[PDB]
Amino acid sequence: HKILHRLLQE
Amino acid sequence: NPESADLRALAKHLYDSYIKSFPLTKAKARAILTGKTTDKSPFVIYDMNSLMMGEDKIKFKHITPLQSKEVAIRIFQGCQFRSVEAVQEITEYAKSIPGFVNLDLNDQVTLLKYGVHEIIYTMLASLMNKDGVLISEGQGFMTREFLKSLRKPFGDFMEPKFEFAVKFNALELDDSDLAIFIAVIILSGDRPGLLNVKPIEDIQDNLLQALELQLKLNHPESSQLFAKLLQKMTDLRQIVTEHVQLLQVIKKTETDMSLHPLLQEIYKDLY
Numbered sequence A: 001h002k003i004l005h006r007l008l009q010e
Numbered sequence B: 001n002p003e004s005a006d007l008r009a010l011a012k013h014l015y016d017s018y019i020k021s022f023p024l025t026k027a028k029a030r031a032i033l034t035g036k037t038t039d040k041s042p043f044v045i046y047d048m049n050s051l052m053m054g055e056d057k058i059k060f061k062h063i064t065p066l067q068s069k070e071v072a073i074r075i076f077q078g079c080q081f082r083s084v085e086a087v088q089e090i091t092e093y094a095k096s097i098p099g100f101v102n103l104d105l106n107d108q109v110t111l112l113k114y115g116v117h118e119i120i121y122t123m124l125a126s127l128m129n130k131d132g133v134l135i136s137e138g139q140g141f142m143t144r145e146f147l148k149s150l151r152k153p154f155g156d157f158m159e160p161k162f163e164f165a166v167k168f169n170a171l172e173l174d175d176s177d178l179a180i181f182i183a184v185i186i187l188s189g190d191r192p193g194l195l196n197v198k199p200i201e202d203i204q205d206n207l208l209q210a211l212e213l214q215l216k217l218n219h220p221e222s223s224q225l226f227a228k229l230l231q232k233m234t235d236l237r238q239i240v241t242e243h244v245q246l247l248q249v250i251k252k253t254e255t256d257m258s259l260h261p262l263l264q265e266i267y268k269d270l271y
């Protein structure tokens, strides 16, 4: 879930 | 009273962030669908030819579509682009839910992963009627008959969303209501694989009180709208299961179609 992670940290 | 007040505050905060996060409200969609607006009525898409002629006009957040695929596949690449953007909108919205960003990051991930399809279905309902569905900020309108007409498996893809939507739209919820309901869906303590359920359930219990108060104030004539809505939220998980199954099929059986990476992350090890 790299993108989801990235969207969540963004 | 003092507790009521805090729950009214939550409701408003959530409505505000909902308005900021999502481009097309239920209010505007209904205005567009009824014909009760000053805007130019949507371009109707009912066959291969109308799709092609309308592709010029169907902008989303100032993003023009790319200008050789069969009707079914082109429809699916468009719904896929919109879904990705919805996932991103829903993620921004989730972050505005008080306490959500203080949760374990792995659990924020898991809540989104399972929540997004439920919410997408909920928000599709705002854009639908018995005739069809508004697309791309309401510049287009795609007929249900046309979508049902597509070659399998794509013909059975949108039909259950329509079936759910005609029943859900009966409850006559508005944007202030939906804003809270969406937050309740996201903060579901029974998603598989959660690490720390308790702070999730504590947030959801406030949200559910906020929802209940909201429905009493905003629909004082509607007897137990709250209870009806909760029953729908449980139906909706079954329906997301059917849909994930259909995509399993489409991924394997339709090799001319690239499923977007964000969507792969979400569908992988889901039901």
Ligand SMILES: Cc1c(C)n(Cc2ccc(-c3ccccc3C(=O)O)cc2)c2ccc(C(=O)N[C@@H](C)c3ccc([N+](=O)[O-])cc3)cc12
Pocket (backbone or CB within 6 Å): B055, B058, B059, B060, B063, B064, B065, B066, B067, B074, B075, B076, B077, B078, B079, B081, B082, B083, B084, B086, B087, B120, B123, B124, B133, B134, B135, B136, B137
């Ligand atoms: C079929 C379709 C097309 C062709 N476009 C335009 C478009 C414009 C640009 C691009 C595009 C953009 C970037 C890069 C490449 C392309 C490209 O051209 O391929 C693709 C299509 C759409 C835009 C929105 C929707 C939509 O709202 N669907 C509903 C059912 C919905 C579905 C889901 C949700 N939802 O809340 O998830 C709401 C409404 C559908 C379409």
